[PDB]
Amino acid sequence: PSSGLRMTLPYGLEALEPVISAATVDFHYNKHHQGYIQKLLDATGLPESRINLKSLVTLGPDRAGENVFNAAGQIYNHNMYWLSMVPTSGSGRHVPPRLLKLIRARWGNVDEMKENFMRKATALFGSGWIWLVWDTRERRLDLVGTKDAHSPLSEDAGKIPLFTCDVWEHAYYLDYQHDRAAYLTRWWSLINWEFADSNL
Amino acid sequence: LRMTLPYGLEALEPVISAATVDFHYNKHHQGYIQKLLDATGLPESRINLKSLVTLGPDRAGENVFNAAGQIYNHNMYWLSMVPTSGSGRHVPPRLLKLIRARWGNVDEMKENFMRKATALFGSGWIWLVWDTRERRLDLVGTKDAHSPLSEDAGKIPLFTCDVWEHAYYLDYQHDRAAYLTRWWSLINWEFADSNL
Ligand SMILES: [Fe+3]
Ligand SMILES: [Fe+3]
């Protein structure tokens, strides 16, 4: 699901309320997220059926071309993001024991984890993304920031993406304006911990 | 305290909304002032804004730089605009002949501005600069908190259009182009020309 050009929203536009308004999901998904799709079609000139999304993201902005990469990267990223949140009446809010043991090993308990995430996620300067990753080189969880359209996948340095929080101002500005931390504290309550564990 | 707004919050309507000027200026712009003080541990009296900007993030340190650059960039941003009631003024004759020299007329400049300002990916800024090395007007984009002042090669900033989404999101959402063509009517040519 997480791969693939044209991912359908796995839920309604208001299913993230009251953390992220219907208005925000509407613009984020139907404007930003779709815009990137056309954008990638226009920049490759390829038909949908010929585009391998992850392959472009790993290829990188140099080999793929800045604008092919920014588009593809943004699609992969936005894919991961919608998948990272549980709607109202979804499931996935509970931490599978497997992932839970790993997070306790890194940070002690989830409270400590949230606190490092808030620290790193508020400080990220500019347009970017926050990722929980599993570091394969080091066999441990970690929190990583990437800029613009970059990712653990495009950095291709052994870090496997588990979840992502969009930190571009378009992700929260309608709802929280300058107050990214307010957005972040509440986006935590949305995490699909199941999905995260499944990327292990 | 670097700085004060020339107009009231509503002075840029209908291009930019009172709400956007309030958040942009009172939370965003002003907020970096208290970030700068802390990151440097210095008082207002002991901080030279341009000094830290031209130092860059390696010399000044990442947070000092990001903050000082944003106070400078925003200082330029507000002064690059005039109230919509003051719109439509002639570009001073000295600036105009430089514009024509470069792009034929202003309309062709504007088209170049739209192309560059619409393509900048992520957060950043669009500047009109005098290119000392090249003896001519130019339009450039810089990323995040960077600026022609940061670059320090020889490009003098004449005006800036803020292109971070906070600049336009409440009014135009994803539609940056829409923000861009209308922002153009607000350009403070007096300021721009005065910056040569
Ligand atoms: Fe986004
Ligand atoms: Fe700004």
| Three-state secondary structure readout of chain B | CCCCCCCCCCCCCCCCCHHHHHHHHHHHHHHHHHHHHHHHCCCHHHCCHHHHHHHHHHHHCHHHHHHHHHHHHHHHHHHCECCHHHCCCCCCHHHHHHHHHHHCCHHHHHHHHHHHHHHCCCCEEEEEEEEHHHCEEEEEEEECCCCHHHHCCCEEEEEEEECCHHHCHHHHCCCHHHHHHHHHHHECHHHHHHCC
Q: How many CB atoms lie within 10 A of CB A94?
A: 10
Task: Give all strands of the β-sheet with B136-143 in edge-to-edge order.
Answer: B136-143, B124-131, B155-162
DSSP structural state of residue A126 = S
- The β-bridge partners of B161 are B126
Interface check for B173 against chain A (CB to CB < 8 A): the answer is yes
Task: Please tell me which residue of chain B has the smallest CA distance to A35.
Answer: B174
Burial (Cβ within 10 Å: 0-12, 13-18, ≥19) of residue B88: exposed
Q: Which of residues 120-139 of B touch A (CB under 8 A)?
A: 121-123
The ligand that comes nearest to the alpha carbon of residue A169 is 1
Separation of CA B144 and ligand 2 centre (Å): 10
Q: Is A77 on the interface with B (CB under 8 A)?
A: no
The resolution in Å comes to 2.5
Distance in angstroms (rounded) separating the CA atoms of residues B185 and A133? 46
Place of tokens 């957060």: B123
Q: Which helix (H) or strand (E) holds A167?
A: none
A197 is in an annotated binding site: no
Contact B122 A148 (CB under 8 A): yes
* Burial class of residue B171 in the structure, from the number of CB atoms within 10 Å of its CB (0-12 exposed, 13-18 middle, 19+ buried): middle
CB A129 within 8 A of CB A75: no
Contact between A39 and B174 under an 8 Å Cβ cutoff? The reply is no
User: Which residues have beta carbons under 5 A from ligand 2 (an ion)?
Assistant: B 162, 164
* Nearest-by-Cβ selection for B169 from A147, A149, A169: A169
CA distance B194 to chain A (A): 31
| d(C-alpha A122, C-alpha A180), whole Å | 6
Instruction: Look at residue A199 and give its three-state secondary structure.
Output: coil
Query: Left (φ > 0), alpha (ψ -120 to 50) or beta: where does A127 sit?
Result: beta
Burial A48-75 (b: 16+ CB within 10 A, else e): eeebebeebbbbbbeebbebbbbbbbbb
Whether the CB-CB separation of B86 and B185 falls below 8 Å is answered with: no
Burial of B15 (0-12, 13-18, 19+ CB in 10 A): buried
Spacing, Cα B149 to ligand 2 middle (Å) = 17
**Gap between the Cα atoms of A150 and A101, Å rounded:** 29
CA R_g for chain B = 16
Residues lying with their CB under 5 A of ligand 1, a single-atom ion: A 166, 168, 171
Alpha-carbon distance B176 to nearest alpha carbon in chain A (angstroms): 11
